[PDB]
Swiss-Prot record, chain A:
It comes from Mus musculus. Homodimeric cytokine expressed predominantly by T-lymphocytes and NK cells that plays an important role in the survival, differentiation, and chemotaxis of eosinophils. Also acts on activated and resting B-cells to induce immunoglobulin production, growth, and differentiation. Mechanistically, exerts its biological effects through a receptor composed of IL5RA subunit and the cytokine receptor common subunit beta/CSF2RB. This is Interleukin-5. It is found in: Secreted. Expressed in lymphoid cells, including spleen, thymus, lymph nodes and peripheral blood mononuclear cells. Disruption phenotype: In IL-5 deletion mice, the intestinal eosinophilia that developed in WT mice during T.spiralis infection was completely abolished, revealing the importance of IL5 for the increased production and recruitment of eosinophils to the gut during infection.
Length: 105, 106
């Protein structure tokens, strides 16, 4: 899933009037730009958006694509605790998590 | 308040307690296959926890454990800030577009 992203971004733009058409719908919007932290809310709002948007159009194109991206990230997430290693290499990982967190705000 | 340079102190204590912490060699802890830390916060602090529960307690290492505990809470609060504010669809779509936008960097 490499630039099925640029296709997903083009489909989004091109279906903005349709999706934007419900003005009653309120969805979760993170207060910040740590997107990775908020994947649950992003994809569950996307979900509500779907069960209320009229189906079958060329939006299906958008919807399967995001579905793919969702899958990708369900896999990324399994990759978090699937491998157990030794305490050195876990410390290493925490060290460098901690090292990038100095900038994450 | 946002933990700022409690990060460097945590970094310094980590290093300084690496002999003790790495002293159990039978211990196997979850380590993420990739560097997308924030998608993995759960697994990070579950491993830290297992590690705690068999590191001997009371030492200078408590410093290190309250420090991460502090960071944990700050992230528990970032995570509550995901769904706390509900806005309208275009500002949701804005945030989606720009999430997808930094996702092409891989």
């Amino acid at each position: 899933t490499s630039t099925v992203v640029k296709e997903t971004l083009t489909q989004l733009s091109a279906h903005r009037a349709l999706l934007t058409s419900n003005e009653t719908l309120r969805l979760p919007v993170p207060t910040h730009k740590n997107h990775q932290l908020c994947i649950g809310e992003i994809f569950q709002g996307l979900d509500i958006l779907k069960n209320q948007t009229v189906r079958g159009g060329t939006v299906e194109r958008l919807f399967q694509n995001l579905s793919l991206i969702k899958k990708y990230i369900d896999r990324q997430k399994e990759k978090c605790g699937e491998e157990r290693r030794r305490t050195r290499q876990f410390l290493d990982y925490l060290q460098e998590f901690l090292g990038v967190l100095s900038t994450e705000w």
